[PDB]
Symmetry: C4
Subunit: 31 residues, 4 copies
């Protein structure tokens, strides 16, 4: 069951990169 | 108590999807 | 060790609410 | 493999702190 949690963790990490990137876009835009 | 973790994670992901959608609206509204 | 993970999960949840709220502010602002 | 989870979580949180700071700059730059 540990490998099921690890899929989610990685998926969560991916989503965090995407959000961090969306935020940098918006930032560069405004500036 | 590994299921309780996987439940939390799943909740986390939903929040992240919502955050992601927020940034989409922010991008349209902006650029 | 499960209760150490649970502190982090909750802390992560908290931070997600804060970010979701920061995003709604920005959104309301722009609009 | 419960430590590997706690490591991931800690990584997640750092990302969330960074996202949080991004939204701070976005708010200043904007309002």
């Amino acid at each position: 069951r540990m490998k099921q949690i690890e899929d989610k963790l990685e998926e969560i990490l991916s989503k965090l990169y995407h959000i961090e990137n969306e935020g940098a876009r918006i930032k560069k835009l405004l500036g």
